[PDB]
Every structure is written in structure tokens, then in C-alpha cells.
Design a protein around this motif. Sequence first.
Motif, PDB file in Angstrom:
ATOM      1  N   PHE A  88       0.825  -1.199   0.000  1.00 55.12           N
ATOM      2  CA  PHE A  88       0.000   0.000   0.000  1.00 55.12           C
ATOM      3  C   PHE A  88       0.869   1.263   0.000  1.00 55.12           C
ATOM      4  O   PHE A  88       1.606   1.516   0.952  1.00 55.12           O
ATOM      5  N   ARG A  89       0.781   2.037  -1.079  1.00 57.83           N
ATOM      6  CA  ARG A  89       1.518   3.296  -1.232  1.00 57.83           C
ATOM      7  C   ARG A  89       2.970   3.253  -0.736  1.00 57.83           C
ATOM      8  O   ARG A  89       3.398   4.097   0.061  1.00 57.83           O
ATOM      9  N   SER A 270      -4.738   9.072   3.038  1.00 51.09           N
ATOM     10  CA  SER A 270      -5.589   8.203   2.222  1.00 51.09           C
ATOM     11  C   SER A 270      -7.078   8.311   2.595  1.00 51.09           C
ATOM     12  O   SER A 270      -7.948   8.414   1.723  1.00 51.09           O
ATOM     13  N   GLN A 348      -6.910  -2.373  -0.140  1.00 55.08           N
ATOM     14  CA  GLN A 348      -5.613  -2.979   0.145  1.00 55.08           C
ATOM     15  C   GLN A 348      -5.599  -4.463  -0.169  1.00 55.08           C
ATOM     16  O   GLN A 348      -4.571  -5.008  -0.571  1.00 55.08           O
ATOM     17  N   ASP A 354      -8.925   0.224  -7.083  1.00 50.70           N
ATOM     18  CA  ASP A 354      -7.884   1.131  -6.619  1.00 50.70           C
ATOM     19  C   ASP A 354      -7.749   2.266  -7.632  1.00 50.70           C
ATOM     20  O   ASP A 354      -6.776   2.343  -8.382  1.00 50.70           O
ATOM     21  N   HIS A 356      -7.019   5.331  -7.292  1.00 51.02           N
ATOM     22  CA  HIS A 356      -5.906   6.237  -7.110  1.00 51.02           C
ATOM     23  C   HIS A 356      -4.560   5.579  -7.393  1.00 51.02           C
ATOM     24  O   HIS A 356      -3.523   6.231  -7.292  1.00 51.02           O
ATOM     25  N   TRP A 358      -3.034   3.316  -5.639  1.00 50.09           N
ATOM     26  CA  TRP A 358      -2.263   3.237  -4.404  1.00 50.09           C
ATOM     27  C   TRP A 358      -1.533   1.906  -4.253  1.00 50.09           C
ATOM     28  O   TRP A 358      -0.490   1.843  -3.612  1.00 50.09           O
TER      29      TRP A 358
END
Lengths: 363, 363
Positions: A88-89, A270, A348, A354, A356, A358
Motif C-alpha cells: 500500500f503506497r 488516504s 488494500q 484502486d 488512485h 495506491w
Amino acid sequence: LEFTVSANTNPATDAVRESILANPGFGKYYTDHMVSIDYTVDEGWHNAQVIPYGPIQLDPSAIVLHYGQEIFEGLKAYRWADGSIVSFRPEANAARLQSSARRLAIPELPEEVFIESLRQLIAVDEKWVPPAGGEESLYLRPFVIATEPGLGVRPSNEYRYLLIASPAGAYFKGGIKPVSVWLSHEYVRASPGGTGAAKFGGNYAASLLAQAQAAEMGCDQVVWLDAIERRYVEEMGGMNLFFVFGSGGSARLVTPELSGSLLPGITRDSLLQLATDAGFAVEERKIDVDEWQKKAGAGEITEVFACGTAAVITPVSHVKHHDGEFTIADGQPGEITMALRDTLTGIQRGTFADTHGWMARLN
Amino acid sequence: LEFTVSANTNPATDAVRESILANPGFGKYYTDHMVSIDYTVDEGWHNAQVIPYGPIQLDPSAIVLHYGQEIFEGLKAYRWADGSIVSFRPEANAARLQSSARRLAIPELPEEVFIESLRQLIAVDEKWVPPAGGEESLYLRPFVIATEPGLGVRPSNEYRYLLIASPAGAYFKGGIKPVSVWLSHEYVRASPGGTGAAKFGGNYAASLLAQAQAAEMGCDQVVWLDAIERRYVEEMGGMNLFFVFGSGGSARLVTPELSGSLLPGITRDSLLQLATDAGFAVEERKIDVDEWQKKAGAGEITEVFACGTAAVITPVSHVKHHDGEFTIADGQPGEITMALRDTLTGIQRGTFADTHGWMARLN
Ligand SMILES: *Cc1c(COP(=O)(O)O)cnc(C)c1O
Ligand SMILES: *Cc1c(COP(=O)(O)O)cnc(C)c1O
């Protein structure tokens, strides 16, 4: 930067590993390998390698053991239904490690090297990533320590970047349970012109007494108030805080602004975007105990929750402080709180879209 | 506690040791042995032993390497004319380590064990203590680090106490020399209720940028101002500060009071007493930049100096800040400054009478 691999000839048996994955707890067990990268003024970041998880060697006068020059990060790796492994990111953690390093006078680690270290570790310990679908995951702990000897006080010229992984089931001992908080009257998390905006080990050691006090007052976690006016709510332990006003699609979220001493959480950033995606109005401003207690009692503030990588989202149901005590709503997890938590965790886990971008593939 | 001894099989040859003592410097070289004491909940402090100075091992997830739970002390061992090895107020350091431990949620080490560790190290490394009749000495660095593995944020349950020594030559080789200071406008050393009153590693790593900025402004050392009003002078780097009003036997000394965030220096405590013995009036109060510059310009404040274990006393001759710049007197070390330094060093060296019984035998 080229990584060399020194396989672990004595890794945990499949039985032990599977046993750990069944009841991992948090930060209790570690994978078979770890990543190590050394730094010197002349060679810069070099000798990047994947080695067996094991004891670290340090000189008795190593700066980290005397003047606490050290920083760290925290993110996760998840296994998806398609068998892929993602994080995640991760780019966000790479950037924050650089910002933390700058504040602590530590040489920045290239983001591509940071991301690569993650790929290298998962490449050898992928089997330590929990099964797809679930609250379990693999916690990744990137960190840098000053290793140069010498008792002189000054920035170290030698550092060591380490990357370890630890299976994670749940951070708090409640999960779907709300926590009570004590607003610290005696201690502060940080102050203007400090290291509050950095993920610096020193910030945590100095907060141990405050947490013990919260528990002594009959509360689960401590909540920090600004060090200047001792009035504005900042964070709960090592997690950011959100306040929910109203409910339904018309509800709005309020969260303390990045005053410069507040730690810019990635979960926080987020959730602000997810709230907007859901159509909720968002606001980053200052909020004090007075307003909190008043509006909570009035029923305007319907929910409160903390957020962070480890626990994702933790509901706050009870508040206690030097001049009062009150409950939030019915004392149970709020609608929005659980709604946003399900949305984030779903993204996640690869359950929800998703949009964006991420999620990044590690494999 | 019984101390077991493990002699260094490969100690420094006479040639090497002599070469080091001839040009030791500070915190660069270390003696042949070190002291180590382990702590666990079930056995408390145990396994006290004197072993060869060398690399120590720590699990990658050792708390000290993540959440900076660590503390340290600084004192010295001197060789006297009668051949005995003494230390300056070692009991004071033992008590301050316990104070620092309490603030950082670390188990306290009995004063008896602390003093004994000093005796044990000197018993095997006495040959490393510089000759008498000079200003050289052996710097003693006691410190405790959290060693328990686990990424969970909470007080460690396992610690290690270590004691290393580093020969220290004359601090002021080419004669004593004053320093210029820059009052930090952007950074703070600590905040109310924080860890400013504890010898905690975190405090130093967080001040690295401030010191760098002081140098960038054309000054030798950075000076800290209170985090609240950003006007009251606190300390210079890791040293306390004194202000001398007037001169001669009627001179008066002013020094920042122990507000609570200030570090209770032992040199500071000692100098206040020595000033009283010399007949000088003393004051422990607040003093801001405005009064400093005004009175220094009017000639009222005739001298300023910093104090600490390493340098004992360092003259401050030039001051620069966000709203001004000025010199103290003629820019040279003041009369009182040198008088007090000679008196304190004389007691530590055994030249002057130790009426307060500050010197303790180690042998
Ligand atoms: C790590 C941390 C957080 C949370 O950041 P995430 O990126 O969401 O994991 C919040 N507050 C403090 C003080 C922290 O150190
Ligand atoms: C160690 C220290 C001092 C000086 O203490 P002494 O006992 O005199 O050596 C002063 N200020 C700070 C911030 C310190 O850490």
C-alpha cells in the motif's frame, strides 16, 4: 545498486512458519531474511544485500547507542487472490523516510533503492505473506541507524539501512473493539521546532511515561494536545485522529491540520481522499477538548477514530481528561468509522477498485 | 552483584597504547576492557562482568534500534600524585542516571552497582589513565540500552548496561580559546514536561540540524532558548551557561534556573558552590536575550562561559542571533571564568583542598 543474496540455510520449517502465520500477533516473529545496505561518505550507499535474519554487530561507541540518531518506517505487503504480492503506497513511505532522514541529519536513501529493497525481501520470503483475503498481512519495517564509532556529538558518517518483515494479525488487543483515551495533561508528544513530523525513535521513548499514566487513569491509550496552548487535540499514541460530524452521506470529517509538529500519516492522507470519494466533506483544522466534549455531548460529533498502518482504523469510544470525562455516541464503533475502514482494507486486499493507483506490485 | 573478569587476550601493545596516550584526543580511542551488566524481569540486574572491549550483538528488532529507549552519563577518572585513581562526584552521576532512567521508563541501576562498575574497569585498565600533574584524564561513558526484540511500542523488559572508557588529552591544547554562539531561532532543545532534564540520546540526534545551522551562520556553537516564549537563554549545546556581572570579589553570577526542561549539570551544581566559597553572590533565575545584549553592551555583564564534564569551562566571547550581534567585553576569556576553572580543575587534580569531599577513590 546491485543486491547480493546470501540464502538462509537454516530457515524456519514450514510447520513453524505456518504456525506463526496462524497466530502472528504483531512485531513478534520475523521472516527468514533481512535486507542490509551500508553507507559511508566515500562510497555512499553500497554493499546492498539480502542476508539471513540474525544478530547485528555494533561498536560499543556506535552513535546510535549514545545519541539516538535513527529513523524508521512502517508499511505492509499483502497477498492477492491472483497470487500477486502488493504493498500500500510504498512510494509514500520512501518519501517520508527521506524527510525523516533530513530532520535527523541522516543521508537520504534513494526511493528506487527503497522500493527495490522491498522487492528483494519479498522475492526470498514471499511465503511469509499471509493468505489472500483477511486481516493478516506482512508488516515491513525499513530503518536506518548511525553506526560510526566515536563519542563525539555530531552527525554520523556511517549508517546502516535494514529491512525486516514481521507477520501481522492485529495490532491492538481488541480489533473490532473501541478504545478509551486519556488526554495527557503532563506530557507533550512534540513542540514547534522539534522532531514531531519525523518517524524518529526518540519520539517514542519519550512517550512511554505518558502511556503508562493513561493506563493508570483507567484508559487504553494516551492522546496528545499541542505543546503551546495545551488545548488542541493532535494524535492518539502513534496514530492520527479523525472526528465525524453528523452521519449518512451528509456527514463531514474533521482532522487536526499538519501544524508541522504533527506526523503526516499516510493512512490519514488516504482516508481524507476516500472520504471525498464517498462524497463526505473534509476539513483539516484545529480542534480543542472544549469543542470535542461539547459537540460530542450535543450529539453533533457522532464518531471518533484513530488511524495508522498497523491497526488501519481504531474506534475511540470514551474520553477522559484533567477536567472531564465523556462517551462518544453509544460507545460503539460508528457507521462511518467502519464504512471507511472496510473501504480502505478492501482496496488494500484487492477487493475494491484502486482508482488512485495506491497499490504497487512487489512480487 | 559479583563481577566476573574475562581478560582481553589481544590487548593493545605497549607501543600502541603509548602512541595513543601521547595523542589521545577525545572519544577516539578506547581502553582494552569494558563493563557489561544484563537486565531481565526474572533476574533483574545480573551477569555483571568485565570483558574485552569489542563489538556487541543486538537482534535487528532490538527496541533501542527502533524506539530509542536509551540513556547515558559522562564522568572522568584522574590519576593523582600519590598514585591513586580518583573520580569527580561519581555518586552524582549514579543518581542522575537513575533520574534519566525513570524519565525513559528504564529500570534504575543501584548507585552501589554503578560505582562498583567504575572500580572494576579501573582495576584492569588503570594503565590507560593519563599521568598526574596534567589536565589529561580518562573519560568514562556509562550507558543503558533497551535490547528486547519486538516491534511493539512499550517499555523494554530487557536491557544492557555498558561502561567504556576513552583517554582524553588536554581539552585546550593551544591554550584556552573562547567560542562564538548563535541563538537558535528555529529550533528548540526540549519542551515542558519533555525529556530535557534527562541525559537521553534522543535529545542530541534532534539537535544536529540546529548545530549545523549555528555553524552556517558563522558561529561555533548553538545556544538554546525556551520553547515557550523563545526568549529565555537555557544552554549552549550540551553545556550549561553562566553570566558574570561585574568583577573582582564583588562579582555576581547568574545562571538559568532548573525550570524542569534544563539538564541539571554536575559541573553547574559544583560551580555555584565554588562561587559561593569564593564569596561571589549567585543567582538561579531566568534571563532573556534582551537583558543579555543590553547589559553586555552597558558593560554590566563582563563575562559569559559554558560548563560541562568534557571541557569543564569554555568561555563565550561572541553572540549572534535573529535580532542582533555583540561581543562580550574585549572578546577574551574573563577573569572570573578562568579563576573558577582553575579552582575546579585544581580540586579535580588534587592541587586544591576538596572541602566538599567531591573526589572519590576508584583505584
Ligand atoms: C507512524 C506514525 C503515524 C501513522 O502513519 P501511517 O503512515 O498512517 O502509518 C501517526 N503518528 C505518528 C506520531 C507516527 O509515528
Ligand atoms: C551532560 C549535559 C550537561 C552537563 O552536565 P555535566 O554533568 O556538568 O557534565 C549539560 N547539558 C546537557 C543538555 C547535557 O546532556
